[PDB]
């Protein structure tokens, strides 16, 4: 399932 945005958000949260 689409989680590509979630990976980018976790990448912004460090």
mmCIF file with all atom_site columns, N, CA and C in Angstrom:
data_model
loop_
_atom_site.group_PDB
_atom_site.id
_atom_site.type_symbol
_atom_site.label_atom_id
_atom_site.label_alt_id
_atom_site.label_comp_id
_atom_site.label_asym_id
_atom_site.label_entity_id
_atom_site.label_seq_id
_atom_site.pdbx_PDB_ins_code
_atom_site.Cartn_x
_atom_site.Cartn_y
_atom_site.Cartn_z
_atom_site.occupancy
_atom_site.B_iso_or_equiv
_atom_site.pdbx_formal_charge
_atom_site.auth_seq_id
_atom_site.auth_comp_id
_atom_site.auth_asym_id
_atom_site.auth_atom_id
_atom_site.pdbx_PDB_model_num
ATOM 1  N N  . UNK A 1 1  ? 0.842  -1.211 0.000  1.00 0.00 ? 1  UNK A N  1
ATOM 2  C CA . UNK A 1 1  ? 0.000  0.000  0.000  1.00 0.00 ? 1  UNK A CA 1
ATOM 3  C C  . UNK A 1 1  ? 0.868  1.250  0.000  1.00 0.00 ? 1  UNK A C  1
ATOM 4  N N  . UNK A 1 2  ? 0.336  2.365  -0.513 1.00 0.00 ? 2  UNK A N  1
ATOM 5  C CA . UNK A 1 2  ? 1.077  3.608  -0.615 1.00 0.00 ? 2  UNK A CA 1
ATOM 6  C C  . UNK A 1 2  ? 1.537  4.080  0.766  1.00 0.00 ? 2  UNK A C  1
ATOM 7  N N  . UNK A 1 3  ? 2.854  4.194  0.938  1.00 0.00 ? 3  UNK A N  1
ATOM 8  C CA . UNK A 1 3  ? 3.482  4.667  2.168  1.00 0.00 ? 3  UNK A CA 1
ATOM 9  C C  . UNK A 1 3  ? 4.678  5.557  1.842  1.00 0.00 ? 3  UNK A C  1
ATOM 10 N N  . UNK A 1 4  ? 4.810  5.950  0.572  1.00 0.00 ? 4  UNK A N  1
ATOM 11 C CA . UNK A 1 4  ? 5.946  6.738  0.109  1.00 0.00 ? 4  UNK A CA 1
ATOM 12 C C  . UNK A 1 4  ? 5.950  8.108  0.770  1.00 0.00 ? 4  UNK A C  1
ATOM 13 N N  . UNK A 1 5  ? 4.762  8.677  0.995  1.00 0.00 ? 5  UNK A N  1
ATOM 14 C CA . UNK A 1 5  ? 4.656  9.962  1.656  1.00 0.00 ? 5  UNK A CA 1
ATOM 15 C C  . UNK A 1 5  ? 5.027  9.810  3.129  1.00 0.00 ? 5  UNK A C  1
ATOM 16 N N  . UNK A 1 6  ? 4.699  8.651  3.711  1.00 0.00 ? 6  UNK A N  1
ATOM 17 C CA . UNK A 1 6  ? 4.951  8.400  5.119  1.00 0.00 ? 6  UNK A CA 1
ATOM 18 C C  . UNK A 1 6  ? 6.457  8.325  5.352  1.00 0.00 ? 6  UNK A C  1
ATOM 19 N N  . UNK A 1 7  ? 7.192  7.735  4.403  1.00 0.00 ? 7  UNK A N  1
ATOM 20 C CA . UNK A 1 7  ? 8.641  7.639  4.481  1.00 0.00 ? 7  UNK A CA 1
ATOM 21 C C  . UNK A 1 7  ? 9.263  9.032  4.433  1.00 0.00 ? 7  UNK A C  1
ATOM 22 N N  . UNK A 1 8  ? 8.726  9.905  3.579  1.00 0.00 ? 8  UNK A N  1
ATOM 23 C CA . UNK A 1 8  ? 9.194  11.279 3.464  1.00 0.00 ? 8  UNK A CA 1
ATOM 24 C C  . UNK A 1 8  ? 8.893  12.079 4.731  1.00 0.00 ? 8  UNK A C  1
ATOM 25 N N  . UNK A 1 9  ? 7.773  11.796 5.406  1.00 0.00 ? 9  UNK A N  1
ATOM 26 C CA . UNK A 1 9  ? 7.422  12.501 6.632  1.00 0.00 ? 9  UNK A CA 1
ATOM 27 C C  . UNK A 1 9  ? 8.357  12.025 7.742  1.00 0.00 ? 9  UNK A C  1
ATOM 28 N N  . UNK A 1 10 ? 8.650  10.722 7.800  1.00 0.00 ? 10 UNK A N  1
ATOM 29 C CA . UNK A 1 10 ? 9.562  10.193 8.808  1.00 0.00 ? 10 UNK A CA 1
ATOM 30 C C  . UNK A 1 10 ? 10.958 10.745 8.524  1.00 0.00 ? 10 UNK A C  1
ATOM 31 N N  . UNK A 1 11 ? 11.265 11.031 7.254  1.00 0.00 ? 11 UNK A N  1
ATOM 32 C CA . UNK A 1 11 ? 12.546 11.603 6.875  1.00 0.00 ? 11 UNK A CA 1
ATOM 33 C C  . UNK A 1 11 ? 12.639 13.074 7.276  1.00 0.00 ? 11 UNK A C  1
ATOM 34 N N  . UNK A 1 12 ? 11.503 13.768 7.377  1.00 0.00 ? 12 UNK A N  1
ATOM 35 C CA . UNK A 1 12 ? 11.470 15.158 7.808  1.00 0.00 ? 12 UNK A CA 1
ATOM 36 C C  . UNK A 1 12 ? 11.505 15.248 9.339  1.00 0.00 ? 12 UNK A C  1
ATOM 37 N N  . UNK A 1 13 ? 11.008 14.210 10.017 1.00 0.00 ? 13 UNK A N  1
ATOM 38 C CA . UNK A 1 13 ? 11.039 14.118 11.471 1.00 0.00 ? 13 UNK A CA 1
ATOM 39 C C  . UNK A 1 13 ? 12.404 13.629 11.955 1.00 0.00 ? 13 UNK A C  1
ATOM 40 N N  . UNK A 1 14 ? 13.244 13.157 11.031 1.00 0.00 ? 14 UNK A N  1
ATOM 41 C CA . UNK A 1 14 ? 14.586 12.681 11.340 1.00 0.00 ? 14 UNK A CA 1
ATOM 42 C C  . UNK A 1 14 ? 14.575 11.287 11.964 1.00 0.00 ? 14 UNK A C  1
#
